[PDB]
Design a protein around this nucleic acid. Sequence first.
DNA 1: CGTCG
DNA 2: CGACG
Lengths: 475, 227
Amino acid sequence: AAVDPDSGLEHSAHVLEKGGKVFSATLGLVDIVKGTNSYYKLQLLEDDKENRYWIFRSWGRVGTVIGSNKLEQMPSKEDAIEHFMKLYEEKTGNAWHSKNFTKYPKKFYPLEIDYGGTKSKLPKPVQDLIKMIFDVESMKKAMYEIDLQKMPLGKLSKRQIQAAYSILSEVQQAVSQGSSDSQILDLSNRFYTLIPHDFGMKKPPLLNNADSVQAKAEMLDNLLDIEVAYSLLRGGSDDSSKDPIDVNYEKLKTDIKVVDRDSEEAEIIRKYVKNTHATTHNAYDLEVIDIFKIEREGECQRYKPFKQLHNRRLLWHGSRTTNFAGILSQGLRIAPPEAPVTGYMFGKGIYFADMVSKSANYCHTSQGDPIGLILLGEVALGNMYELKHASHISKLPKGKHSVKGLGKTTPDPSANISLDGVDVPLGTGISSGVNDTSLLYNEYIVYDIAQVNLKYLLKLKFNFKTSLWLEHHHH
Amino acid sequence: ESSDKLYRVEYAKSGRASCKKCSESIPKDSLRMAIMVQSPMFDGKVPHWYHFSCFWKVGHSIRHPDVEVDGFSELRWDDQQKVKKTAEASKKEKDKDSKLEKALKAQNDLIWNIKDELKKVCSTNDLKELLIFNKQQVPSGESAILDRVADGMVFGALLPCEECSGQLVFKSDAYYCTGDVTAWTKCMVKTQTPNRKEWVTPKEFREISYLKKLKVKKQDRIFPPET
DNA sequence: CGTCG
DNA sequence: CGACG
Ligand SMILES: NC(=O)c1cccc2nc(-c3ccc(C(=O)NCCc4nc5ccccc5[nH]4)cc3)[nH]c12
Ligand SMILES: [Zn+2]
Ligand SMILES: [Zn+2]
């Protein structure tokens, strides 16, 4: 683990480790009822060499300078650990070796913080793709980054963020109903104690606002999928040959083949992207860099039951490139049954888009990341049970296989093509006439992971129409 | 809502508080005013104390001492009428409010006449036992001990909360529950007519009760006129 | 433990 | 929060 700098001994001493455990407690305390956002860092530090020990305490509010610290050199490690454990007790109410931690009122709460020559012979575009999707550098930029506001105390562990996400599921189901204000107050208390937030001297807010709740949930899902793709990023310890290119290429169990750019299917994909790129609500042009026909292991056979099901279509699915690795390793997944269902526009299930713009908006490619990823999928939308206004659902209607959120903007229905007997809606944005609706662009949704079959993966370039492109566009 | 109420007033719980102006210690059991300020040492407010005169020497424009000061309605009626003055220094409804305020004055003087003999004859452990014997909750501090004893003897032995079952206590505006619904939150249930039973004095405190001359004049907690 | 900073 | 009677 680390060493708090307010002691100043990071260069002169390190934190202690015995019996597997480590002596660095990060207790929090959040009370929205009064507005208390207190912290407490407690460390037992041993000199790098000599047998000299200190107990370091630091307290105050989150993010602000309000607080203090104190270092107390101890006599020996024995007395030092005695004082450390009795301090942990006095503060959090539980003992150091308390397997099951039981929260007590007016007491703090500990927080888990995570720490710690050959040649490939493959086609080159795939190796570039791999270097992108297994980009350990960006993975570290995601997890191991400062951003004090996000992590005012430290990089929380996976279990912490997952528990926070579950409590947010509870918050969502309370927002949907007319829950008691006290229940939501307790939800806020626990969610802010579990995840610290620099609110300055401002009283921490309540989670009454549903939109901010969904935003924090997006943040938590981001961090969660990040740590998951990081756990997938690791795991190799054999086959030390053919560069890690082959290693992480075979870690996906997928057959990836760079579709010839000049090929017919590639031309049809380019026309799809061109027509369905609605610059409206999208301040960025798109350039088709690379095409990849992907055959995912197993997904090919599990899709056969619906191979004959009529009304199959090629659709866009787009998420952060960070997840794409896992999305290729395990195939497109559905939200878990225990995740909240009110946040989803049309409930849990594979989402799709006939407008590449909408699906691309989810890649969250920033100005500093002009490259994005998106997937073309042969989904066998059996029968589209259409829904104009948003509506969370559970029961698939009788003889209906999929949901279609209707937006006024749709691909030109006349402009469509049957590739492999699959309808491709590569038309330009026309006014569907659908009125009294909530969606802008159409949403296509299925509710069976086998109903989908990922066919192509597009490397896209998000040429944001900025000063650079602006100079290139007037000469 | 408490709303902090930085202006604060009460009797000196100890003789250790130093006046932030003259630096002299504030004697125990002496009327003293403070202002609640956010300390830089920890995430928690703290009272800067002053002598009653030193507080008004530093200049304050308190227009409504009752509402802007936490604990104003918990003092002696005489010290109250002193603060009410020092702060700035109808046809029938008029007499109605005047007479009800006279009743408030009587009630305040009565409670203090109680507490006087209460601590004069009884020890702290005796008050603790009195509170225990009425399903109450022993508070921290002799002052709060005698406050809850007087409350239970005048308005009846308080009964557990309806939600969390924690004992509630009288606040400036109404009775607030001090219980903890869960380990993460505190109960904010607030009402002006809580459920109570009658106070009970054991045989031990029978001759002592006679020494107190317990009148047992039943009544109801008068709450502030504000709104 | 109960104040005060 | 810690510090002290
Ligand atoms: N990429 C496409 O192909 C695509 C195309 C068109 C529409 C699309 N909608 C999605 C989508 C949105 C949202 C989610 C999603 O995690 N919900 C989260 C809702 C939510 N609130 C919460 C609040 C608290 C706790 C947990 C919460 N989850 C998944 C897919 N993807 C779309
Ligand atoms: Zn003074
Ligand atoms: Zn209660």
